[PDB]
Every structure is written in C-alpha cells, then in structure tokens.
C-alpha cells in the first residue's frame, strides 16, 4: 500500500487519544480556540473595544473575565493578524479584538472537526452515526448565535463575548431589545431543553428503580456485566408503574431512546431558527392587537404590556455604556422611571 | 389588582388576552400572606378582584 | 400496465397517531396567538 | 380585540391539514389484513 494508506494506518491506530483524519482539523482548532480563550481571559483587555476590563491581569474574576468582541467600527472584519487592521502587530491585534475572531473561527472549524470525528469513529467501530447527527444541534446553535446573528447586525461587536458575565449581558440584551422570551422559536428551545433534562432524569431514575436483583450487594452497581445478554432492569414493571402513575408509558425501548435524541436536538434547532430571525431584527416583539387596545384604553393592562415597560427601561439604562460607539448622552430627565425608584 | 394599588391586570382570554399573554394573576399585595379563601370575601366579585383564584389554585 | 415492484404498504400505528396529533395541536396552541397577532 | 382576519383560517388549516393526513394514514393501517 502507498503513502496515503500508510498514513491512514498511523492516523487510525488504537491509542489513548484517537487521532484520525478528522484529528488533523480538530486538534489544532480546538486547542487554539481553548488556548485563545485562556490567554485572553488571563492577560488581555477590552479597554479599546468596549471600555471594559476583562482579564485576571486587570482584576477580573472567573465570572467577569471575557474575550470581548471587536469595536463596532471593525464591522465584520475577519481581523486576521496579517490583515489590514493589525498589519502583523500582535499587541495591536489583541487590543483590537483579534482574539475574538480567532476563537470564533477556530472554534467553528474545531466543531466541524469534532463532528467529523464522530462520523469517523462510528464508521471504524461499525455503529450508526446518530451521535454525529445529534451534534448538529450544538453546531446550529453555535453558527446562528456567534456567526449569523452578528453578520446580520452592524458588526461582530454585537455577537456574544466569550465570558460568563458577558454571556449574561447577551441574555439581558436579547430580552430588552428583541423581547426574545416572547419568541415561539425560543419557547420551543426551552421545551426541548427542559424536556430533555426531564427525560434524562426520569429515564435514569426509572432504570435505577426497576433493576433486577443480579447480585447480593446492597450497593447494586457491581451486579452488571457489559457483555451480558439480559436487560438489567424490568421494562415490563417500568411500563406498568408509569401507566398507572402518569397514564402513559414507554413500551418500546428503541422508540424511548430515539425520543431522547429527538427532543433536545429539535429544541436547539428551533432556537437557532429564532436567532436567525433576530439577526435581522425580525422579532416577535409585539402583539399588534394588544398595542391597539392599550393605546386607546389606558385602563387595559396585561403581563405582556408590563414586560415591554421593563424592556424600555433595559434599553434606556443599558445602551449608553453597552454601546459606547453610539456616544449616547441621555439627560436624567429623559430616562424612563416609575415612581420613587 | 395584583399590586394592591387598585390597578387591575387582565389575565383571562375573554378580557383581551391570548395564550401567550394570559394568566391567572397573583392575589393582591394588600392581602400579603393572609389566607384568602372564598368564604373570607364578601362576594365572589370581591374575591375575583383581589386575586382569590390564585391562592385556591 | 405491469405492476410496479417498488410499491410498499404504508403504516401509522395508533401511538404515532396520538403523538402526531399532540405535536400538531400543541404547535397550533403555541403559534395561534402569533397568527391572530 | 383587533386581531388579524387571516388568523382564524391560518390556525384552522394548520390544525386540520396535517391532522387529517395522520388520520388517513392511521385508518388505512387499521384496515390492512
């Protein structure tokens, strides 16, 4: 066999950490994305892009460090180190937000490499590649939130910054500006995530509480053998319990486990669709019938109208410091406030 | 009147809500943590104005 | 016309019916508010 | 409430069209030998 097949042999050796052809893409990009995040959150400022401190070196903690997006004036520049903005200057590149695109782009190709890894390993051990298919949901979320959304907006500045508190700000921005909780695609996401967590808990608990006694120990974990032919728990008893408790129960184990893939994966895909809309400010912001009634009838109030007042406060009170390129000056008298507060 | 300030919030479908905006509204701030069963109200009309259904549910 | 050998019967069992109707009805309960707007 | 006049027909067909699709498939499954 030729050099390609010799290379294929070495790439697919059974070792502690499997490499594979996909590893050529995955390992550099994953390592650089992670290394970029640790480097930036440890040493790198956001003073010139956001007017923020964002690193351990400046005094931030694990919750407040971030690798922040570039300034809005960078637009959607790839911000390559050798590009026209940094012109090869590593220090300037960091000050300009170059680590943000570095992490986002290497992270994107790393995620491609990881899903290729799932295909490659499944093919080598001889299993169907449903794990790779389930991973399309993380990828749809990453691509829609970190790439499509800022690409629809004015610049990378409005992408999420890579940090704990930075992400929290992203949540609150989406409430105040997009009314994102009102969006039926986000609601489907919530259902998929919370339903996924429910299925996770309920399935694990059911298996663990319909186990057969397959050993003498009061700690029951040792009474299982991976190569055994027999089910380790009673599907029949599990089915009767839930039929009598809840009204319906699983009876087909293949359907049950497919459903566990389907629910969270579909939920994440739906949330991605909503975010693609928010890229264009195509929000579910209002109910027109509500606004017409409320505008004409000052005694009409719902929780929907209450939440918009919260949104209006969020926008007015957060925009001047959250969007410094806009140079907003809102004199005290224009700020929306209720009584006393 | 969720916040006890005589500013009643509409929760029900027949009173201008849809599935997304509708709610059973919490009982009045004037009640606080007081137990407010139906038989504490002078009338069902009072009971409804003050958010009685929320406590029962 | 000779019979096409690629035909197959199609099935939808009762559980799939109940699951499908739930999906459809719950989707309608979710999206109807936005259709009325 | 001044709702969209097409909301009713939109909701009605959204329910009915896929629902009847499923009922058609279910019933012809039951009637198979």
């Amino acid at each position: 066999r030729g050099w390609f097949d010799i290379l294929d042999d070495w790439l697919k050796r059974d070792r502690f950490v499997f490499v594979g052809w996909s590893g050529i893409l995955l390992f550099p990009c994953a390592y650089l994305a992670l290394g970029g995040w640790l480097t930036g959150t440890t040493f790198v400022t956001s003073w010139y892009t956001h007017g923020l401190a964002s690193s351990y070196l400046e005094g931030c903690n694990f919750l407040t460090v971030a690798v922040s997006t570039p300034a809005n004036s960078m637009g959607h520049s790839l911000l390559l180190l050798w590009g026209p903005e940094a012109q090869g200057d590593f220090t300037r590149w960091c000050q300009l937000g170059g680590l943000w695109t570095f992490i986002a782009l290497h992270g994107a190709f790393g995620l491609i490499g990881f899903m290729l890894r799932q295909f490659e390993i499944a093919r080598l051990v001889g299993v169907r590649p449903y794990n790779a298919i389930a991973f399309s949901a993380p990828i749809a979320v990453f691509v829609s939130v970190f790439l499509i959304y800022p690409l629809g907006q004015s610049s990378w500045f409005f992408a999420p910054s890579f940090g704990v508190a930075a992400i929290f700000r992203f949540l609150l921005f989406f409430q105040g500006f997009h009314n994102w909780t009102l969006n039926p695609f986000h609601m489907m996401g919530v259902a998929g995530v919370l339903g996924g967590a429910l299925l996770c808990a309920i399935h694990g608990a059911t298996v663990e509480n319909t186990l057969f006694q397959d050993g003498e120990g009061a700690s029951t974990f040792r009474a299982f053998n991976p190569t055994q032919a027999e089910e380790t728990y009673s599907m029949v008893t599990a089915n009767r319990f839930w039929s009598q408790i809840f009204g319906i129960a699983f009876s087909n184990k293949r359907w049950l486990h497919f459903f566990m893939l389907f629910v969270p994966v579909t939920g994440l895909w739906m949330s991605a669709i909503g975010v693609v809309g928010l890229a264009l400010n195509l929000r579910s912001y209002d109910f027109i019938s509500q606004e017409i009634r409320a505008a004409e009838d000052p005694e009409f109030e719902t929780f929907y109208t209450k939440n918009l007042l919260l949104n209006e406060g969020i926008r007015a009170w957060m925009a001047p410091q959250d969007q410094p390129h806009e140079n907003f000056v809102f004199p005290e008298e224009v700020l929306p406030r209720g009584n006393a507060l | 009147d969720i916040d006890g300030i005589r500013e009643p919030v509409s929760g029900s479908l027949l009173y201008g809500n849809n599935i997304i905006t509708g709610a059973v509204v919490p009982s009045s701030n004037a009640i606080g943590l007081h137990f407010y069963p139906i038989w504490e109200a002078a009338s069902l009309d009072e009971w409804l104005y003050n958010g009685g259904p929320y406590q029962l549910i | 016309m000779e019979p096409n050998p690629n035909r197959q019967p199609v099935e939808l069992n009762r559980t799939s019916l109940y699951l499908g109707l739930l999906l459809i009805l719950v989707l309608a309960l979710l999206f109807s508010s936005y259709f009325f707007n | 409430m001044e709702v969209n006049q097409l909301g009713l027909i939109a909701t009605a067909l959204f329910v009915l069209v896929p629902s009847v699709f499923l009922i058609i498939l279910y019933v012809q499954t039951e009637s198979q030998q």
């Binding site: 039929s243 009204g247 009876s251 | 479908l13 849809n18 | 009762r14 009805l25 719950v26 | 329910v15």
Partner: peptide, 30 residues
C-alpha cells in the same frame, strides 16, 4: 373568535389525553 379558537384547541388536547390513556394500544408481552 380568538377565544373560541384557543379554547377549541385546548379542548381537543384534553380529549386527546383521554383517548391516548384509556384507548391506547395495549402493551402486550410477546
């Protein structure tokens, strides 16, 4: 009209619960 529509869909779901529970395909051990 909207209220009728919302309550109608809800009522169909509750009816669906009844049939899905009491008129389910019975689990059979084969």
């Amino acid at each position: 009209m909207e209220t009728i529509t919302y309550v109608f869909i809800f009522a169909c779901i509750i009816a669906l619960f009844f049939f899905a529970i009491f008129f389910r395909e019975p689990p059979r051990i084969t």
